[PDB]
Design a protein around this ligand. Structure first.
Ligand SMILES: C[C@H]1O[C@H](O[C@H]2[C@H](O)[C@@H](O)[C@H](O)O[C@@H]2CO)[C@H](O)[C@@H](O)[C@@H]1N[C@H]1C=C(CO)[C@@H](O[C@H]2O[C@H](CO)[C@@H](O)[C@H](O)[C@H]2O)[C@H](O)[C@H]1O
Ligand SMILES: OC[C@H]1O[C@@H](O)[C@H](O)[C@@H](O)[C@@H]1O
Ligand SMILES: OC[C@H]1O[C@H](O)[C@H](O)[C@@H](O)[C@@H]1O
Ligand SMILES: OC[C@H]1O[C@H](O)[C@H](O)[C@@H](O)[C@@H]1O
Ligand SMILES: [Ca+2]
Ligand SMILES: [Ca+2]
Length: 686
């Protein structure tokens, strides 16, 4: 299939995602609406159910509202059955309209629809070449008080109707009972409850296996992507085995939400995108795009620096989901904000690297503050707003122009208010010029691009006041004045003669799994895929065509590999690095070490003999381990994804700066379970 196919569930850079709060989009079936205190048909109480459902999204795909816009992926509210309680928080009544308060991950939320409505949504979306991404929130079930078992549904978790347990009298320890987080540390935020949500205990084998069985069920129903909620609040080791479960079973594009505020750059955030096996919502892009295009607290140099810097800091920048607002931010468009600002920011996101996500109602200029006011019902389904037309013209370029789906980003002209950047992938080029100043025209002189000579028409058709670009010899453009608020997109596409890899998904899997390599110039005839210097040819290449290769990961040792393609003619591609071949299936094991006293700045880490534990390398050791919530110093603990069903050797070490102190004695051995979790409780060997 080509890279742009609806069946490419592994990579979404050629897609434009439309993020839908199911309840707030279209009530296509009023018979499934909540009744009583849980429902507000006027949707003026934004914490109640307004009635929107999966039949409503089907109707909007069918009648061309979503497809007219060029949307090729929808991201909907978590589909699982939620609690039915209307919770009163100091006066306001609150319901599970948002899908985040699960009670059964194997059943649907009936307000949204039946399991048959879900399959009809999947099939209708696919028949219209729309991929379906669902939220999945495995961190917690629902508001619970162990002190008051009658509050809400006491966080109860059911397994396809069968009650597993609740928060009060949790003798099985399905949940964490350490109090609520104050967000002071990542550890604190992981093992304590978010607010009052009953925190699931992923170290409990029943919880571990249940959530992994539940995600496989939704993958069996044909979902094409997963947005994981609260990745900052679950153990990294468990989420890496969770990702290995998905990737070793049916790999689909998975990204998580790790919130970053304005100007916050976090190494942990970047480590998570680079090493977890899922990508992230690109809050670094979103916050800077809002600073430059919305709030004017930064200028185009800030924008250039984020684009240049993010291309390096994210190992796979083409997998990051970009957006200018979403459910956790005030809407981009303000009451007194010029609409041109929204239209430019959307033109910027749609032509930028990564996977653009448009929050529902952006095209209808919805404004609103923070939750719940950014989740109002969308007011109109008008197909003629300028913002609808901006998405309609630019979203198709993700499928048709590989420079926009995969290309590098090159700033070609800039000043405080104007950026002209170029996306390049082989000989495919897109050039985007944006003047954010709504008053001053920009005189552009000396612009050089990679466009062949010609008179390029603005793909936006002058609707954001763009113009034709005349390109002469050597990509030099004839000088022009960029209008106040002007935005223009110029492009050139042609065939790639060289194999060029633009994206690979999944990026972590065991031997035997088929990965998807997308790009251009692979040719029709089966060539060679290199994992390191290991050639994979012939029958292990499951599919080969010019834009997409599907190949089985060879049985190489676990570790990180560069991928490279050589077409049938021996021409080799660029290297696509950081592929992790896992040692096998994964299980999360909790390692607990007692009596590991440390100095200030000295932390305990774990390493061992499998790639998953850094292969005995102190620079790649797992940690720093935790030592405050589940166990307290000098006992340290950490949840680590390790190969299932085997004896690993490992040792703990203390690291402070450059100094590694290994524990003495013989290497430790442990035989990991085949599924479920295990705890290793040991004592520091001096
Ligand atoms: C729990 C959230 O924590 C992080 O995001 C926060 C961030 O820390 C704040 O500084 C920022 O101002 O707001 C964000 C949202 O609260 C984390 O990175 C996020 O992934 C995470 N937000 C998720 C999770 C939930 C579950 O609580 C959603 O909230 C919903 O639940 C509450 C109470 O249970 C309901 O009353 C709300 O109506 C729901 O939105 C977040 O919206 C979701 O984005
Ligand atoms: O500073 C690193 C470590 O040093 C210890 O002295 C301290 O008691 C621990 O709580 C800390 O994690
Ligand atoms: O008035 C606004 C209401 O919104 C929130 O849900 C608060 O929890 C609640 O206590 C407050 O009174
Ligand atoms: O057998 C004990 C030895 O095992 C491991 O290879 C450790 O790397 C080493 O530092 C330790 O001293
Ligand atoms: Ca309904
Ligand atoms: Ca948690």
């Amino acid at each position: 299939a080509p890279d742009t196919s609806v069946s490419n569930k592994q990579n979404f850079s050629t897609d434009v995602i439309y993020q839908i709060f199911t309840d707030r989009f279209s009530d296509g079936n009023p018979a499934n609406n909540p009744t009583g205190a849980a429902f507000d048909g006027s949707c003026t109480n934004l914490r109640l159910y307004c009635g929107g459902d999966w039949q409503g999204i089907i109707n909007k795909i069918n009648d061309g509202y979503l497809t007219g816009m060029g949307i090729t992926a929808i991201w909907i509210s978590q589909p699982v059955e939620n609690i039915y309680s209307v919770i009163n928080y100091s006066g306001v009544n609150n319901t599970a309209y948002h899908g985040y308060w699960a009670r059964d991950f194997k059943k649907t939320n009936p307000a949204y629809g039946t399991m048959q409505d879900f399959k009809n949504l999947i099939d209708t979306a696919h028949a219209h070449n729309i991929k379906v991404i669902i939220d999945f929130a495995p961190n917690h079930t629902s508001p619970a008080s162990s002190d008051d078992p009658s509050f809400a549904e006491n966080g109860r978790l059911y397994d396809n109707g069968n009650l597993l347990g609740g928060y009060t009298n949790d003798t099985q320890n399905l949940f964490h009972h350490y109090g609520g987080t104050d967000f002071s540390t990542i550890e604190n935020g992981i093992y304590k409850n978010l607010y009052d949500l009953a925190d699931l205990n992923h170290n409990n084998s029943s919880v571990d296996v249940y959530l992994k069985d539940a995600i496989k069920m939704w993958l069996d129903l044909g979902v094409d992507g997963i947005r994981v909620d609260a990745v900052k609040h679950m153990p990294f080791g468990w989420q890496k085995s969770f990702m290995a479960t998905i990737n070793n079973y049916k790999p689909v594009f998975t990204f998580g939400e790790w919130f970053l505020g304005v100007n916050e750059i976090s190494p942990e955030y970047h480590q998570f995108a680079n090493e977890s096996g899922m990508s992230l919502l690109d809050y670094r892009f979103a916050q800077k795009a809002r600073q430059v295009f919305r709030d004017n607290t930064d200028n185009m140099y800030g924008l250039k620096a984020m684009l240049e810097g993010s291309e390096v800091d994210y190992a796979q920048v083409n997998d990051q989901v970009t957006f200018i607002d979403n459910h956790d931010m005030e809407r981009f468009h303000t009451s007194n904000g010029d609409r041109r600002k929204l239209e430019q920011a959307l033109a910027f996101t749609l032509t930028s690297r990564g996977v653009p996500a448009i929050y529902y109602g952006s095209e209808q200029y919805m404004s609103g503050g923070n939750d719940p006011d950014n989740r109002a019902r969308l007011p109109s389904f008008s197909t003629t707003t300028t913002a609808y037309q901006v998405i309609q013209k630019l979203a198709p370029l993700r499928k048709s122009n590989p420079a926009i789906a995969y290309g590098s980003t090159h700033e070609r002209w800039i000043n405080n208010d104007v950026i002209i950047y170029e996306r390049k992938f082989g000989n495919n080029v897109a050039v985007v010029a944006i003047n954010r100043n709504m008053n001053t025209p920009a005189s552009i002189t000396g612009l050089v691009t990679s466009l062949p000579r010609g008179s390029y028409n603005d793909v936006l058709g002058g609707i954001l006041n763009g113009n034709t670009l005349t390109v002469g010899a050597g990509g030099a453009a004839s000088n022009f004045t960029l209008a106040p608020g002007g935005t223009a997109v110029w492009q050139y596409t042609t065939d790639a003669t060289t194999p060029i890899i633009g994206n690979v998904g999944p990026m972590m899997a065991k031997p035997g799994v088929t990965i998807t390599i997308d790009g251009r110039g692979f040719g029709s005839g089966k060539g060679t895929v290199y994992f390191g210097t290991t050639a994979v040819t012939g029958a292990d290449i499951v599919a080969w065509e010019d834009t997409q290769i599907q190949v089985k990961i060879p049985a190489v040792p676990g570790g990180i590999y560069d991928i490279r393609v050589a077409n049938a003619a021996g021409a080799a591609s660029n290297i696509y690095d950081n592929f992790e071949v896992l040692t096998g299936d994964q299980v999360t094991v909790r390692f607990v070490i007692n009596n590991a006293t440390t100095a200030l700045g000295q932390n305990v880490f774990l390493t061992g003999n499998v790639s998953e534990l850094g292969n005995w390398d102190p620079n790649n050791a797992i940690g720093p381990m935790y030592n405050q919530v589940v166990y307290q110093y000098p006992t340290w603990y950490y949840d680590v994804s390790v190969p299932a069903g085997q004896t690993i050797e490992f040792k703990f070490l203390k690291k402070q700066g450059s100094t590694v102190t290994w524990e003495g004695g013989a290497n430790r051995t442990f035989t990991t379970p085949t599924s479920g979790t295990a705890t290793v409780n040991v004592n520091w060997q001096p």
